[PDB]
Design a protein around this ligand. Structure first.
Ligand SMILES: *[C@@H]1O[C@H](CO)[C@@H](O[C@@H]2O[C@H](CO)[C@@H](O[C@@H]3O[C@H](CO[C@H]4O[C@H](CO)[C@@H](O)[C@H](O)[C@@H]4O)[C@@H](O)[C@H](O[C@H]4O[C@H](CO)[C@@H](O)[C@H](O)[C@@H]4O)[C@@H]3O[C@@H]3OC[C@@H](O)[C@H](O)[C@H]3O)[C@H](O)[C@H]2NC(C)=O)[C@H](O[C@@H]2O[C@@H](C)[C@@H](O)[C@@H](O)[C@@H]2O)[C@H]1NC(C)=O
Ligand SMILES: *[C@@H]1O[C@H](CO)[C@@H](O[C@@H]2O[C@H](CO)[C@@H](O[C@@H]3O[C@H](CO[C@H]4O[C@H](CO)[C@@H](O)[C@H](O)[C@@H]4O)[C@@H](O)[C@H](O[C@H]4O[C@H](CO)[C@@H](O)[C@H](O)[C@@H]4O)[C@@H]3O[C@@H]3OC[C@@H](O)[C@H](O)[C@H]3O)[C@H](O)[C@H]2NC(C)=O)[C@H](O[C@@H]2O[C@@H](C)[C@@H](O)[C@@H](O)[C@@H]2O)[C@H]1NC(C)=O
Ligand SMILES: OC[C@H]1O[C@H](O)[C@H](O)[C@@H](O)[C@H]1O
Ligand SMILES: OC[C@H]1O[C@H](O)[C@H](O)[C@@H](O)[C@H]1O
Ligand SMILES: [Ca+2]
Ligand SMILES: [Ca+2]
Ligand SMILES: [Mn+2]
Ligand SMILES: [Mn+2]
Lengths: 239, 239
């Protein structure tokens, strides 16, 4: 049984277990800021940043047909300082081909290049979307399960508790093919749940990189923070 | 679309929207005590109690083949005062045939008569089991999804935060047939999740009673409290 796991209770600047891309940065206080924060302390628009674990994960094997079960937990906060324009764009936990670089920002969240359902993306993602694009349901923010497309196969609206810490748990059970996610805000006690059937063998390559990506808007001040405080992950490929 | 819903932020003694069975009682403080509490304030063993919503729920229709999606949320606390003997037995949210009366107590939780997988039970339940019976996994307590049997088709161990309030969310998506449940302890921030595929048409009758049931042990002092503070439910049969 191939098992892989990591747990960051906080982030250490300079650690070589995380690959920072784009605007992503680890502060001296141990916070992972996915998108840029200006010197005035305000979030910058037109910013895209990602953080990928430095080791690829064996998610499934063609030879045996076995598929791994996995679970990831992370805490983040989104702070929206301006009344107008509308804040954007969101953050997303994703799994895709190894050695990947940032894709298009804005509503594509740094992981897609367009709004098409393309099998060549080979990407699975759980988004926390803050801006309603034309391919989005009118309600924002919302949790969404993305399978080879920014056009989610399932969405769940949630109320943002501005600047408060949210706890996320995402679990994938290989035997049932159920991807289930939960978002909890300790501040208000709010609990949101979403689940859908996803056969990862039809989406992802055998080996994948796991990461977090965030993006701010295409127009001046259409922005918000995308700060991550902790992140853990475990995967077990049965054998 | 046939929709039904109810929300009890607290329980009112004497309300006629709830059918109390066995030991179940609503206190002056607004708490639903599923199992008996002695005059000394300690939980009594050999106690079984249930509470059913007074109106039956239309879960599916044979004529159209349509199935309802539903969600229930409730808060409860289990307090285990004795070091020995081991506490028992647990509580469970369930759906089954209308006009039902309490079944066997103890490890059967007031909803089953034996440990067999019998289609005649026509019962679906999400248990919070505190005692390991021979049909149980060794880890207790645990959340379990019960389909026509006390022998869960899926279990998830959890750590009890003695006497603290736990929040539960159970959701069933008819389109995907996924039953997903979440348990959160605000006191410690612990989050537990469990999900499984359940086609209710193969289990439940068209109309069902929804309720909560609790039970204490078969031997002296093998007991604990099973207090419920709030309970809400919504179901929508597509049409
Ligand atoms: C977070 O980052 C940390 C820093 O990189 C990770 O810890 C490193 O993990 C490396 C494993 O990938 C590990 O590398 C080995 O280091 C051995 C020597 O260092 C130890 O022993 C020294 C005394 O001999 C002692 O002074 C040190 O303090 C260490 O105790 C070395 O012998 C190993 O080489 C063998 O294996 C390689 C790979 O098969 C062969 O190429 C080699 O011939 C030999 O057979 C190995 O060396 C590494 O080999 C690959 C090469 O590219 C690297 O340059 C070379 O370093 C390394 O020791 C530790 N570093 C420290 C300070 O502990 C950490 O990984 C997790 O923790 C470690 C301990 C391990 O359990 C990993 O599996 C974990 O993932 C990262 N954490 C996470 C969550 O990612
Ligand atoms: C929690 O318990 C509450 C108390 O039981 C529930 O509220 C009751 O809900 C009853 C619906 O099942 C409802 O019953 C109707 O009452 C009508 C008369 O009362 C109203 O109007 C009076 C003036 O005329 C006024 O003084 C009262 O204060 C009320 O405003 C009555 O006309 C209705 O009868 C018609 O419909 C029945 C059924 O088809 C026919 O049989 C009848 O011929 C006529 O066509 C109806 O009466 C009830 O009929 C069935 C019979 O067995 C009953 O004895 C008889 O009462 C009742 O008014 C309210 N009571 C109060 C105080 O509001 C509550 O239900 C929820 O809220 C209500 C308002 C409704 O929206 C329900 O759908 C909700 O579920 C329970 N809550 C929950 C979550 O379960
Ligand atoms: O106004 C901000 C908004 O700008 C464009 O519409 C982009 O497509 C969106 O993703 C968002 O960034
Ligand atoms: O000791 C308590 C214990 O007693 C018997 O074993 C019952 O079968 C269990 O459900 C539990 O009540
Ligand atoms: Ca969007
Ligand atoms: Ca048991
Ligand atoms: Mn979206
Ligand atoms: Mn059990």
């Amino acid at each position: 049984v191939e098992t892989i796991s990591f747990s960051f209770s906080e982030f250490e600047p300079g650690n070589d277990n995380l690959t920072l891309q784009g605007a992503a940065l680890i502060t001296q206080s141990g916070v992972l800021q996915l998108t840029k924060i200006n010197q005035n302390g305000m979030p910058a628009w037109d910013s895209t940043g990602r953080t990928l674990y430095a080791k690829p994960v064996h998610i499934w094997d063609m030879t045996t047909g076995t598929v791994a079960s996995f679970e990831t937990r992370f805490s983040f906060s989104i702070e929206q300082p301006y009344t107008r324009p509308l804040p954007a764009d969101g953050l997303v936990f994703f799994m895709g081909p190894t050695k990947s670089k940032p894709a298009q920002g804005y509503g594509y969240l740094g992981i897609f290049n367009n709004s098409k359902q393309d099998n060549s993306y080979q990407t699975l993602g759980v988004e926390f979307d803050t801006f309603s694009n034309p391919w989005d349901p009118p309600q924002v923010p919302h949790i969404g399960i993305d399978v080879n497309s920014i056009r989610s196969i399932k969405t769940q609206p949630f109320q943002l508790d501005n600047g408060q810490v949210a706890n996320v748990v995402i679990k994938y059970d290989a035997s049932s093919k159920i991807l289930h996610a939960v978002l909890v805000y300790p501040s208000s006690g709010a609990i949101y749940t979403i689940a859908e059937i996803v056969d990862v063998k039809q989406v992802l390559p055998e080996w994948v990189d796991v990461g977090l990506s965030g993006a701010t808007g295409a127009q001046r001040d259409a922005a918000e923070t995308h700060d991550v405080y902790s992140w853990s992950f475990q995967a077990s490929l049965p054998e």
